[PDB]
């Protein structure tokens, strides 16, 4: 129908599409399973149909580089639309071409190593909070649910690093400011709503004229005014994302107020469930590989004797920790794919690409390719040792993507997660319960997350 | 366009419609203002257009009777659809024709005077709760917001009379069971979403296939399982609406489980903001007419000396109280209109009515008609004295509608509100603050509710 002959014409293999649905029935096992099977069955490039929308998959690292880096500005600048977005049209990760470029320009200085070293003390205080809450659970030998305790942690670091609000969310789960922000959850792109948006993408315009949005209209409204209060209470009466944006609107064309709110929202959205999720995947591996946990506890005490508090520089000093984080990300790259919309008829690395195709890099499946990783399913942190870390193709292992449009939040995310692990492990060990799901099964959904949530035994090194 | 010549053809007056919008621009001042102006300008019958949808207004009490009573089953059985409803299609107030008739049959015995006398003791306990919360506000001379304290009250009576759950919502505003139920708020039929649904009623089918609903998909999901837990904890291990429905599914065709949940939801929806709102409108009048308040306090002590607790029968004994409630409802009939969809070409009281028209009775405007009420804007409870209560046309004063499809919840609503007022006034007097809005302005919105929320001074008769 109307475009389902495209790949068959270019000589590109793939699963044969059904009318209207294309291949979306093949998502019944999740993006991850579909992508590995496809890589296996079909080889180095393949093609499928998200309804009428042609998606070209690629796995050659040279080709990936062209797309993510070389022709990023010229050809492959934007992501694919996904549903009605309202004013969130202005958020950097949604925006396009020159508005994107301007936004990415206007926001980059907020994510430098400099500002991040200034934020480290704030992100630290809530590690202590995390500990006392964990100790409360450990002095009462009851299995712990990480996503809850790490959620409460991530939530705290966001509320602080982005607005100055200081909440113990785990113990104030019903503060107005914690309630809204806990509704900014990762979109399930295989839930009813989003699948239909894929079979009926013409519906998106209809919703937009009805001010219906995939960002709940009330959470956005709460923050828009919460910001405009903060804005006008500091102006006038250092050191969060909001103040860094306030200072910036003092490319070009400055930052509009509505533009400012939207970024603020996308930072919470980005930083809340990801931090929570990754931190849980890591504690899962640490707990099912007690040697890796011991070796990391040993490393942490070396740098920080006497449970010394971690600093920006003592954090970047810890190599095994960096290894442990990077390998967890290999097995659970929560973005799962990267995607670029081809804006022009192009030819790259010997392959014609017609305008309008979505180019997709199947991150999860490349992270578990046996042709670039030995024993890809095993959790083996040494793959990232300063010895082996050189035989790893930065276009095969892309947990934050690559190029002008990679994750702007990368250094903060990594720092935020590491500060958590250092303080937690300084004080506790983590052990399987019987109710622990070993082996952790991944969700057949549209999200990278455990089937059953991770529950563990926490014990005090006291 | 496609139907805007209808009234002009039948000789029926009304405001001239614009293409596509019909007359909806005339709602800029609210349904209430539009309806009085229309009654004034145009007389005993008029016509307008909710987009393409012809609505015929009527004010002759004989004609109203035919519509609400005589030809209710034959002709005027259903209300007008309003947006996507999901499984709430099964709720009695939404359902149609034989399913309605069956539901109204299967649910009527739950609202008898018998069951209501059995519920009175439950509804009483939360009057005491209401008092201690009020006393806490009165011992701290801070103006009170009625909708909050009455909301918390109404919320408590619902949670109890419908599931057995016993919560002090005002002090547990963050119990999971109170959180969801506080989201079941009255629909604003002049908010963006519903106006568009009126200009684009073809959009309703589109939303329905997207499982988008005007009952938030999460509140419904919470209760559906909350019920199925309650259902299977009482079955097996008297005296609420849920148990009365459980007993009924033990016309005809019994009550399906999904059918049962939906009614449960519609009862909360119905009984929460209405009780809250009416109770606030009443305290407003009592507080701005201190004689009426005194006369009612005097009456209550006569029946119930020593702050005696109210009983079902001592409640029906209080005539001035019944007067005060009924007159408040005159000035603030929160339904505002009644509506019936004409299902066949008919002729009633000398007027042809073509199939598909919505027949509408402008309750608010009839309640303030100078041709049936002297000084209609004044709050004068004596209009309802056992002397004058006979010169009041039950088809002009219809705060609960009339006929086979009037409010099934009427006796409960009235009893629930009166039990509140008796206990409250036994203990407190209510006085204007400076921040009180005198005179209360009504919302220009699609709801009957105060412009500014009612704030009063509460003082202890101790
Ligand atoms: C463990 C944590 C995180 C992971 C694994 C992650 C991963 C990713 C990935 C794969 C992308 C797409 C990059 C590409 O297209 O090549 C991305 C984009 C993005 N991330 Fe993250 N992310 C994380 C946390 C964060 C945080 C904390 C922020 C805070 C501001 C953030 C903000 C963004 C933004 C704004 C984009 C889009 C940038 C643009 O399109 O210009 N992310 N992230
Ligand atoms: C002060 C409180 C209330 C007022 C003023 C009120 C008013 C009304 C009005 C005007 C109608 C439409 C009747 C008609 O079309 O003629 C109605 C319908 C209805 N009410 Fe209420 N109501 C109140 C409280 C309640 C309560 C507590 C319940 C509890 C179950 C309830 C359940 C219903 C139902 C189910 C219908 C639709 C009945 C049907 O269509 O078969 N209402 N109400
Ligand atoms: C999908 C939500 C997160 N809307 C995005 C728009 S594009 C940023 C990217 C989304 C994405 C990556 N491959 C995809 C393949 C198909 C469809 C969408 C995507 N993000 C992403 O990794 O999200 C998680 C970890 C998958 C939840 C947005 O604006 N996200 C802010 C954000 C979120 C998370 C991390 N960093 C930034
Ligand atoms: C509109 C909401 C309440 N959906 C109803 C469907 S029809 C019951 C009726 C609605 C109604 C009366 N004139 C109208 C004129 C135009 C459009 C709709 C209506 N109710 C009604 O009085 O609602 C309040 C007090 C106006 C909020 C529903 O199912 N409502 C359950 C319910 C609510 C309140 C009282 N009793 C029952």
From Swiss-Prot, chains A, B:
Polyubiquitinated in the presence of AMFR and UBE2G1 and also STUB1/CHIP and UBE2D1 (in vitro). CDD domains: CYP3A. SUPFAM superfamilies: Cytochrome P450. Changing residue 192 to R: In allele CYP3A4*5. It comes from the Eukaryota. Induction: By drugs, such as rifampicin. Heme binds at residue 407. Changing residue 196 to P: In allele CYP3A4*2; exhibits a lower intrinsic clearance toward nifedipine. One of its GO terms (biological process) is monoterpenoid metabolic process. GO terms for cellular component: cytoplasm; endoplasmic reticulum membrane; intracellular membrane-bounded organelle. It is found in: Endoplasmic reticulum membrane; Microsome membrane. Keywords: Disease variant, Endoplasmic reticulum, Fatty acid metabolism, Heme, Iron, Lipid biosynthesis, Lipid metabolism, Membrane, Metal-binding, Microsome, Monooxygenase, Oxidoreductase, Steroid biosynthesis, Steroid metabolism, Sterol metabolism, Transmembrane, Transmembrane helix, Ubl conjugation. Pathway: Steroid hormone biosynthesis; Cofactor metabolism; retinol metabolism; Steroid metabolism; cholesterol metabolism; Lipid metabolism; fatty acid metabolism. Interacts with PGRMC1; the interaction requires PGRMC1 homodimerization. A cytochrome P450 monooxygenase involved in the metabolism of sterols, steroid hormones, retinoids and fatty acids. Mechanistically, uses molecular oxygen inserting one oxygen atom into a substrate, and reducing the second into a water molecule, with two electrons provided by NADPH via cytochrome P450 reductase (NADPH--hemoprotein reductase). Catalyzes the hydroxylation of carbon-hydrogen bonds. This is Cytochrome P450 3A4. It comes from Homo sapiens (Human). The gene is CYP3A4.
